[PDB]
């Protein structure tokens, strides 16, 4: 029934293609055209700790997969799934006859092993990955038959199919029972014997070294770890290698609509390059068939990328980042500065700071005019769009900023012209920033000059990553600048709207610590934030789509009313490229880690014309 790549037909030692495929392979409809076999995809990683560059090239092979427009998911590794009307139980049907890369059967036993003996095993994971929890509670995972697996959660868990389409939700398909059980004491009663050979103290360390985890280097550094990936490691991603090579999985489990077993492309070759400038040089000379991850953020490179398209033989395409803001101001409402805190906690003070900002200037200078003014809210293309959350207080209005600050009682000036607190002291805010993030540093320098005209002093505290994070978790900052997620991914990454992320909800990480500790640690949030946290717990456990929509829209509305975080610009278009010869790249796909882009575009159906 099916056909195969010439390089596999060249291999007389493989089983027949019909026996390498499942009985019912997943049929992949191409982005643009039915493809032809062959070729080597040339791409690039920066340094030797860039393993997600492989994952975002080949794609997580999860139980479900995002649609191209990322509005929902469809069965992927699973042939089909069902959900109970209370949304607590998900049952997945697997593809009979599907095989791992080593030709052995892929069955419910593998999913149940991955969940019950790895993911939910507390020696392996003392903290269970949140992808498999609802309100912090784990499901019961059970084998129904050789090709059916059931997940039973203790509360409704409507987001689970979406979670299973993200890179962090792929554990269910990551662990082959046969191979991995060798390193597990419930199966290998002599496993302690493997420890010294592998230089490990315990079996979780052995399991991580041999069988790995979503983002561990060990995922890509061995050639013997079985997978269901479209290409397989052949020259591995060691810590000092200069190139990685992957080759088609002869047991890949998908066909195109003509019955060709995928992928079309035979091999992927990754250059490992230490200097981002050398990557830009190579890319703008056409040496990569795809680069849609590393170059797109450096707006300084777009002019040369565009100019050299004809010379290099490539096409630039623009992608919309999922992030709502490229460099947003997180205002710390639990700042230890008691005089400042009296104003930081006032909505109108935060409003005044936003009105004193000139986002057109920030865009022109920091982003070469390629971004656009924006606050924190989802984009119009998102079902979560809230006009107020997106666009309030965006236009420069220095007169109104000063009117508000006068009304708040900050009229007395010091000898330098700055406003002072009633009790004395310059109105001054410390902003922490990671020094190597140049556009963010430049953004803060611009805001510093702009806020001077409102009589407010911004003190830039740039540092390397460790001190930047240590300052945040120590509650030692007034402002922190970093991205606002939520343009497209608001429910996946809600950190700007409700203080649930322990490192990044920097309207107050002490508030987040209170939320995550059941109120025993951290600092009790204000009523509007406690209300959102309660709504968020209700949302995660919502029993119907309509209830979930209502609850999360309410969170976004309260966030808009409170105006806790101040956006500068939504990201410029992400400049990506592919060779003109490379077909079936979805140039309309969004950009983002939750969709593992560019692999969202189904690289197994890219092909060379």
Author numbering: 2 to 610
Please give me the paper's original passages concerning this structure:
SPH1118 has been identified as a pectin-binding protein involved in both pectin chemotaxis and assimilation. SPH1118 shows high homology with the solute-binding protein (SBP) associated with the bacterial ABC transporter. SPH1118 consisted of two domains with a large cleft between the domains and substrates bound to positively charged and aromatic residues in the cleft through hydrogen bond and stacking interactions. Here we show tertiary structures of SPH1118 with six different conformations as determined by X-ray crystallography.
The space group of this crystal was C2221. One molecule was included in the asymmetric unit of the crystal. Residues 1 and 611–619 were unable to be assigned because of the poor electron density map. SPH1118 consisted of 21 α-helices and 5 β-sheets built from 15 β-strands. The C terminus of the C terminal domain (residues 573–610, Fig. 2a cyan) in SPH1118 formed a small additional domain and was located in the direction of the N terminal domain. SPH1118 is the first example of SBP in cluster C that binds to polysaccharide such as pectin. The surface electrostatic potentials of SPH1118 calculated at pH 7.0 showed that the cleft between the two domains was positively charged. Interestingly, SPH1118 showed three conformations [SPH1118 (open form), SPH1118 (full open form), and SPH1118 (closed form)] even in the substrate-free state. The crystallization conditions of SPH1118 (open form), SPH1118 (full open form), and SPH1118 (closed form) contained the substrates (ΔtriGalUA or sodium PG). However, no substrates were bound to SPH1118 in these structures. Compared to the C terminal domain of SPH1118 (full open form), those of SPH1118 (open form) and SPH1118 (closed form) were closed by 18.9° and 34.2°, respectively, suggesting that the domain of SPH1118 was flexibly opened and closed even in the substrate-free state. The crystal structures of SPH1118 (full open form) and SPH1118 (closed form) were obtained only under crystallization conditions in the presence of sodium PG. Conversely, the crystal structure of SPH1118 (open form) was obtained under several different conditions other than those shown in Supplementary Table 2, indicating that SPH1118 (open form) was likely to have a more stable conformation than any other substrate-free conformation.
